[PDB]
Design an enzyme around this catalytic site. Structure first.
Site, PDB file in Angstrom:
ATOM      1  CD  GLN A 183     -57.345  -9.085  -9.379  1.00 49.72           C
ATOM      2  OE1 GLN A 183     -56.367  -9.847  -9.341  1.00 49.72           O
ATOM      3  NE2 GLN A 183     -57.259  -7.837  -9.816  1.00 49.72           N
ATOM      4  CB  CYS A 203     -53.257  -7.963  -8.992  1.00 47.58           C
ATOM      5  SG  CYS A 203     -52.414  -6.368  -9.510  1.00 47.58           S
ATOM      6  CG  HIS A 260     -51.758  -9.488 -12.759  1.00 41.87           C
ATOM      7  ND1 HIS A 260     -52.788  -9.018 -11.979  1.00 41.87           N
ATOM      8  CD2 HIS A 260     -51.884 -10.836 -12.784  1.00 41.87           C
ATOM      9  CE1 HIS A 260     -53.518 -10.038 -11.562  1.00 41.87           C
ATOM     10  NE2 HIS A 260     -52.998 -11.151 -12.050  1.00 41.87           N
ATOM     11  CG  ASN A 270     -54.015 -14.768 -11.822  1.00 35.17           C
ATOM     12  OD1 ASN A 270     -53.802 -13.672 -11.255  1.00 35.17           O
ATOM     13  ND2 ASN A 270     -54.481 -14.854 -13.068  1.00 35.17           N
TER      14      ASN A 270
END
Ligand code: NA
Length: 220
Positions: free
Chosen positions: A19, A25, A163, A187
């Site tokens: 990102q 996110c 997040h 992630n």
């Protein structure tokens, strides 16, 4: 439920993205979950455009690089009637005007499902649905420097998450402390973070870092 689940092995999961320095996110978690439910339906894995969500899902409550929510992205895709592919609408890590083009839509959904706030229910969802969008408290130096093993942060909050990430499975490994269960979490900070961009987050430890508190998936 199974003791171990890894949806990457079933083809549900695109490679790790990055990102950059944009608070998007939530767009990566959302695309991650929709990529999974689209694959489930069609058997085709297509990377989806986070920039599309960043630029365009403001009417659903999202605020671009200033933050958002996966459920709002899921609603945008339903309201909008589509979402463009990553290839057609590539990621620039800055908020811009909406350039969505329906001819390049490669995904849809008909809403979303919110999972009850319990790791038991999250486990049942991951086992039967596929990758699940979740919110976590990633605001700790320990999270930045994670390299391997089961991540456990005693100062992690179960209520104040900041997040969005994607649970692609869960499992176990023997540890010093015998706290051996983990959620397997994709992630969006690139491959160089963590274990090739993944983290094993402590599982069935009192909703560690809030992983079960805001979990959902799109209905395709
Ligand atoms: Na990286």
């Amino acid at each position: 439920a199974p003791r171990s689940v890894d949806w990457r092995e079933k083809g549900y999961v695109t490679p790790v993205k990055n990102q950059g320095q944009c608070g998007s996110c939530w767009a990566f978690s959302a695309t991650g979950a929709l990529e999974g439910q689209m694959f489930r339906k069609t058997g085709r894995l297509i990377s989806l455009s986070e920039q599309n969500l960043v630029d365009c899902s403001g009417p659903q409550g999202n605020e671009g690089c200033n933050g958002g929510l996966m459920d709002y992205a899921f609603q945008y895709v339903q309201d909008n009637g589509g979402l463009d592919s990553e290839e057609s609408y590539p990621y620039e890590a800055t908020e811009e005007s909406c350039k969505y083009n329906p001819k390049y839509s490669v995904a849809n959904d008909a809403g979303f499902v919110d999972i009850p706030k319990q790791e038991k229910a999250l486990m049942k969802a991951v086992a039967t649905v596929g990758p699940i969008s979740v919110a976590i408290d990633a605001g700790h130096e320990s999270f930045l420097f994670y390299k391997e093993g089961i991540y456990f942060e005693p100062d992690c909050s179960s209520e104040d998450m900041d997040h969005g990430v994607l649970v692609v499975g869960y499992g176990f490994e023997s540890t010093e402390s015998d706290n051996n269960k983990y959620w397997l979490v994709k992630n969006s900070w690139g491959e160089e973070w963590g274990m090739g961009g993944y983290v094993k987050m402590a599982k069935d430890r009192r909703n560690h870092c809030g992983i079960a508190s805001a979990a959902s998936y799109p209905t395709v």
